Ligand binder design. Structure first.
Ligand SMILES: Nc1cc(Nc2ccc(S(N)(=O)=O)cc2)ncn1
Length: 287
């Protein structure tokens, strides 16, 4: 579009390139992403919340679609890589987890799911805020095996009910993803770095135990389930995210529950004792 001045490529998303751009009219600096779907996007423009990257505009032109979002200076992946040596302090890990749960609770309350949470889509600013980007685009446009650049879409944060072929998942898939992200900020290593759908499922099984009819009623009937899956024992949590404390380990165990109906909701998670002492520190951001 002619109203925006591209300032630089931020990177390649699922659906297309993402640029930093200046609006010539209003002078704002935004993130320009080149991409029923139209009807879907328009619903999202209305779901505003402090921890959700604002959707400013939707420009469909010549069968060409562009989304204009609020711009933030850095993503959680880069931030994690830069704090790799010392680790992000716990007070900041807690404040981020806390804010992200506030964002999921709002969206989930309007029955909108994210479906593809990952560090690349969690954006931060110098004031200690963290927000979720691309919320709802998966349902609008779905999730491909490969991006527009043929890049592999990461499976690291995918919930087990999705890997087992359930067609109608719930908001429980986002809590699983976020719990994988919490574990990663803590240990400074991805929890389940799968390189294929089966390696991803088997990595989950090896740490959390092959699920059964006792812990996940109905699991054995799922479309992609196989009696031949190996049966690994569940590991103990202290070995999972050391040295996280017991409140943190408890909340995480609740976010990684196999049965989606038992998995904690975002709203209940915000009440967990882990948050009693939550504060809002600021990252040391060098832009
Ligand atoms: N998808 C985005 C991204 C974005 N900005 C942004 C994201 C990542 C980076 S990085 N790779 O430098 O951390 C920089 C800016 N702002 C809004 N939407």
């Amino acid at each position: 579009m002619e109203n925006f001045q591209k300032v630089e490529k931020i990177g390649e998303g699922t659906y297309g390139v993402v640029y930093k751009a200046r609006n010539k009219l209003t002078g704002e600096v935004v993130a320009l992403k080149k991409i029923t779907a139209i009807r879907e996007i328009s619903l999202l423009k209305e779901l505003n919340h402090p921890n959700i990257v604002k959707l400013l505009d939707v420009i469909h032109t010549e069968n060409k679609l562009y989304l204009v979002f609020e711009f933030l200076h850095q993503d959680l992946k880069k931030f994690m890589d830069a704090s790799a040596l010392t680790g992000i302090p716990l007070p900041l890990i807690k404040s981020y987890l806390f804010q992200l749960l506030q964002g999921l609770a709002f969206c989930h309350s309007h029955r909108v799911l994210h479906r593809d949470l990952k560090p690349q889509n969690l954006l931060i600013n110098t004031e200690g805020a963290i927000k979720l980007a691309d919320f709802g685009l998966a349902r609008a446009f779905g999730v491909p095996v490969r991006t527009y650049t043929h890049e592999v879409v990461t499976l690291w944060y995918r919930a087990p009910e999705i890997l087992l072929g359930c067609k109608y998942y719930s908001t429980a898939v986002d809590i699983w993803s976020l719990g994988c992200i919490f574990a990663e900020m803590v240990t400074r290593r991805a929890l389940f770095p799968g390189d294929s759908e089966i390696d991803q499922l088997f990595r989950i099984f090896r740490t959390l135990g092959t699920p059964d009819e006792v812990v996940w009623p109905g699991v054995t009937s799922m479309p992609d389930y196989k009696p031949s899956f190996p049966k690994w024992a569940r590991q103990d949590f202290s070995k999972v995210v050391p040295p996280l404390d017991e409140d943190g380990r408890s909340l995480l165990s609740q976010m990684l529950h196999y049965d989606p109906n038992k998995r904690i909701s975002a709203k209940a998670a915000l009440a967990h004792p882990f948050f009693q002492d939550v504060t809002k520190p600021v990252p040391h951001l060098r832009l």
